[PDB]
Design a protein around this ligand. Structure first.
Ligand SMILES: C[C@H]1O[C@H](O[C@H]2[C@H](O)[C@@H](O)[C@@H](O[C@H]3[C@H](O)[C@@H](O)[C@@H](O)O[C@@H]3CO)O[C@@H]2CO)[C@H](O)[C@@H](O)[C@@H]1N[C@H]1C=C(CO)[C@@H](O)[C@H](O)[C@H]1O
Ligand SMILES: [Ca+2]
Ligand SMILES: [Ca+2]
Ligand SMILES: [Cl-]
Ligand SMILES: [Cl-]
Ligand SMILES: [Cl-]
Ligand SMILES: [Cl-]
Ligand SMILES: [Cl-]
Ligand SMILES: [Cl-]
Ligand SMILES: [Cl-]
Ligand SMILES: [Mg+2]
Ligand SMILES: [Mg+2]
Lengths: 548, 571
């Protein structure tokens, strides 16, 4: 049932098929397992699942190296299990989007094997081949510590092929019109199955051109317009999300032509948000947050920013920044917490040293700042990570359902699990798990669920305007979200100590602030500045109720 | 009996007749704190080694439950020799060494002393029953029948069939308010009175800073009375206070009288002399009332017991603590006639389940950190001298199956090492085991783990004690409850009467605001008398807007609290 704005009102939940629930005791999470846990997901109150790549893959780069776009990784199930999942989610009002890597395939993909073995055949030009490694010299090597070059010599074809990512991930040749059609057909295949949309990954790198750094080319945007057009024409109500790990000013291009109301991606991610919030709290100053928001350009009214509490892009493990436009550019390296975690994904609780007050503060900001928020699976119970598993796999350990064997994720033997659960005294499944948190109304899980329920009752959080209120105290960030008569006031203390703030709310004189969890009515707003007092790292949400 | 001279003595601190009013006490069991000799049992030498932690924490006086020689049938409240420490704990010499080391750091020590009764293994009782016409013949209360004092209740009614027990050797009944193995001393025998004063003098000569006198309401019995709170009992307490003040100025007597506050006031003595009995007594109903105030999200249960608490002598001070039960009898104080919450405790399922069992703070509050902070804030800011129980500062749990008292007497959890770092002995030799569950176990909850993060409960508690220590109003200030629009919020101001050295933050008034609701609450306060003053929040030192003629609006998160110094305005 089409609702062309659903993505603006959605809370997304990024969940890995491999990690959520193993229904068949092979030690690996699967589609049937995820289907069996949909009642939990509905109960939590999220609106759309975001599944990282689950296609057939040799898994040398986390499944971002795809061997077959048309096939589910066999240990997850088949496309039939995927449709079962889709139907069960839809039946509960939950949508599903997935990652789709557009720039490159695994070298195990049959297209590449045909390209190298049969250069004269129909796949001969499906990839970017050269007698020399000299072309495109201005393109940086993304994985500079691992790849000596963006060109690799193939021993079968005896020419170099191009890859922006690892050598086992050859780039598709988008100047070949058969490649463009083949990739459009991949989109249609999953859309026909009923998927609600895609996050398109690595799209800034589609086209290469001499004289350029081979990112963000106009031909790249042109292909994205084809994708959007195919969606608009054939599957209305579906969504395209861009993964462009760039400064927000540069990302706005990915929404497309403003005069059209946006003709490329419906959404794109605002990557610098979490690094700025993290630094605002470290510095006890609202300015890193105020500034990043104020400097973010307007986007088409059809579009929406995606936001999440992570410091790194999951594809490249890089944190966005900009020498010229980021006033905090040199500051990140001066923070020992940021410095220790460079290039490693970490979960929310570990990022905040398990401080429950800060977890709540960061989560409140995620749920009230402009954009559609993405929650990462397990953050709602305060799961930890295991950094030694890898820069990405750190945060991909099994969902911790119960304090039972394997955290209740699987009936297999522990040695057969795809990755082990946390076992330490702080984050281990004996103390951190869904079951333990279900009872108390004061658990992080129940708190998170309640915050989602509150957010869902106020359209202002999803699509409202954003007005930062300033105020006497630079340690406090206060703002109003407004839709036109749903008006909400959010006040956030970035300081570890109690703070007073006096706000000029004269425009809303007469209005009565009603705090959104206890529904207590606060003193009516007058002509004098309104005094609010917050504990360290505290926050309040108020509905601004019109007078009688 | 040993003769004091035969031992060393601790060096005395400069006498300070009001030290106990400013003190935060720390109740710590010798058996539980630290085992220095790998026998699985905490000891005096071990406690001495841990004085550095105690000093760092910032408490002013240790309160040690009984450590005398005892067969330990009733937790050591059954004393076999008043002049001897239980051998597993060490000797009198070790106690003197502990006292000296504590005194070096400015830390005092008091101990429990049971006045009403001894173990039946005490030699006085063995002599009393074997040799009736000897000098101990009337040291206890003997009778040919079990008919005397019928109006006295049986305290342990589910265990003891009578307050009289027939002795097989003497063939007469002897009286005991507590268990049958704890015969009552006969205070009508002046030799008993002198013997007990001699016990006090023994420990005072060694250098102890005072005593909590246990079971004192039950000293004397008289026909036609319920045998509690008799005039002769109070008269004996005046002797103890007289001996204390004449011979050892600057020491303290605390009364353990588990009674309604209007009734325990008598234990401070004659108000006309400024108080001539105990310097201190416990305000037992405070925690049950705070507990109820939070359960009902209303300030009134707290407001009311405070308002109904009668004034006490100028030299005197209430003791307060976050427990619902007296450790001696495991009873919660109540009063059918005078407690308006009398029937309400039995309606609360948490209160109900824990009847007669000591529980630690974190377990009482289901490990809710915000509530632990709220209750701790109240303990540290309400009138009285507070007692912290060892381990509550790190959020230790308890083990209820160990017994109604032993639940809270498990080893101090120092580290996540073997035996929680309490001992090098094998685990099977520990006097009691540490908590081992996922919530409160020593792998998760221990001092070492909390020392690092400035956001741990330990560091928070230590900072709160530091803040309290720098503001006299918390210790000896007046108490002015402020009312307010919102019944869910308890607000009060505490003030020092000046003199000598005037201002400074140390003597400025303090404002405390406490949210008993689990939801954010506004409160508007009429603080017009403090117009112009600037509230400065005590932990972060942020200046809040100056007080004016309008009501002052403060907003609190669920279960939150603020402490403010009221600073006088610039001229
Ligand atoms: C997020 C919020 O969680 C908690 O709030 C909940 C309660 O503690 C539960 O008892 C439950 O309350 C209700 C009764 O059970 C039900 O009978 C109903 O009719 O009355 C209640 C409905 O108000 O549910 C509560 C939420 O509805 C925790 O207590 C609370 O303080 C936490 N609050 C924060 C959220 C916001 C955003 O509005 C901020 O304003 C706050 O400062 C946060 O602290
Ligand atoms: Ca490319
Ligand atoms: Ca007696
Ligand atoms: Cl996966
Ligand atoms: Cl398939
Ligand atoms: Cl990402
Ligand atoms: Cl991250
Ligand atoms: Cl002991
Ligand atoms: Cl007690
Ligand atoms: Cl208790
Ligand atoms: Mg499986
Ligand atoms: Mg020992």
């Amino acid at each position: 049932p089409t609702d062309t704005n659903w993505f603006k009102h959605a809370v997304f939940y990024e969940v890995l098929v491999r990690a959520f629930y193993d229904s068949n005791a092979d030690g690996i999470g699967d589609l049937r397992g995820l289907t069996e846990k949909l009642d939990y997901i509905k109960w939590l109150g999220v609106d759309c699942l975001w599944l990282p790549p689950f296609y057939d893959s040799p898994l040398r780069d986390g499944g971002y190296d795809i061997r077959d776009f048309y096939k589910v990784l066999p240990e997850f199930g088949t496309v039939d299990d995927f449709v079962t999942l889709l139907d069960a989610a839809h039946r509960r009002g939950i949508r599903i989007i997935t990652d789709l890597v557009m720039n490159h395939t695994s070298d195990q993909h049959e297209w590449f094997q045909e390209s190298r073995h049969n250069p004269d055949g129909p796949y001969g030009d499906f990839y970017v081949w050269s007698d020399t490694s000299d072309r495109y010299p201005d393109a940086r090597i993304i994985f500079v510590d691992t790849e000596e070059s963006n060109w690799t010599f193939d021993p079968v074809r005896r020419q170099f092929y191009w890859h922006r990512f690892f050598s086992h991930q050859p780039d598709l040749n988008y100047d070949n019109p058969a490649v463009q059609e083949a990739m459009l057909d991949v989109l249609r295949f999953w859309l026909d199955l009923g998927i609600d949309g895609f996050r398109l990954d690595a799209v800034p790198y589609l086209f290469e051109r001499e004289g350029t750094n081979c990112e963000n080319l106009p031909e790249t945007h042109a292909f994205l317009k084809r994708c959007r057009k195919a969606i608009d024409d054939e599957y209305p109500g579906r969504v395209l999300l861009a993964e462009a790990n760039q400064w927000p000013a540069d990302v706005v291009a990915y929404f497309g032509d403003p005069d059209t109301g946006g003709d490329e991606c419906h959404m794109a991610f605002h990557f610098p948000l979490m690094p700025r919030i993290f630094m605002a709290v470290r510095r006890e100053s609202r300015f890193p947050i105020s500034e990043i928001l104020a400097q973010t350009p307007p986007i088409p009214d059809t579009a929406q920013w995606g936001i999440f509490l992570r410091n790194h892009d999951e594809l490249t493990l890089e944190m966005v920044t900009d020498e010229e436009r980021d006033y905090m550019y040199a500051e990140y390296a001066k923070d020992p917490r940021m410095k220790a975690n460079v290039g490693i994904r970490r979960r929310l609780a570990p990022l905040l040293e398990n401080d429950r007050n800060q977890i709540e503060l960061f989560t409140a900001l995620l749920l009230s700042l402009p954009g559609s928020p993405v929650l990462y699976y397990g953050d709602e119970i305060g799961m930890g990570d295991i950094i030694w598993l890898g820069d990405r796999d750190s945060v991909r350990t099994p969902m911790q359902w119960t304090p039972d064997r394997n955290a209740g994720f699987s009936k297999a033997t522990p040695g057969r699990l795809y990755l082990p659960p946390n076992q330490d005294a702080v984050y281990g499944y004996h103390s951190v798990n869904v079951e333990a948190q279900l009872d108390s109304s004061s658990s992080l899980l129940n708190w998170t669920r309640n915050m989602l329920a509150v957010r869902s009752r106020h359209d202002a959080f999803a699509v409202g305007t954003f007005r930062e209120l300033g105020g006497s105290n630079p340690s406090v960030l206060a703002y109003i979200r407004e839709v036109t008569t749903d008006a909400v006031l959010c006040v956030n203390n970035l300081s570890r100590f109690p703070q007073p703030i006096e706000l000029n709310l004269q425009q809303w004189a007469g209005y009565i602030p009603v705090e959104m969890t206890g529904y207590v009515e606060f003193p009516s707003i007058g002509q004098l500045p309104y005094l609010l007092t917050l504990p360290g790292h505290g926050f309040y949400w108020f509905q601004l109720r019109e007078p009688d």
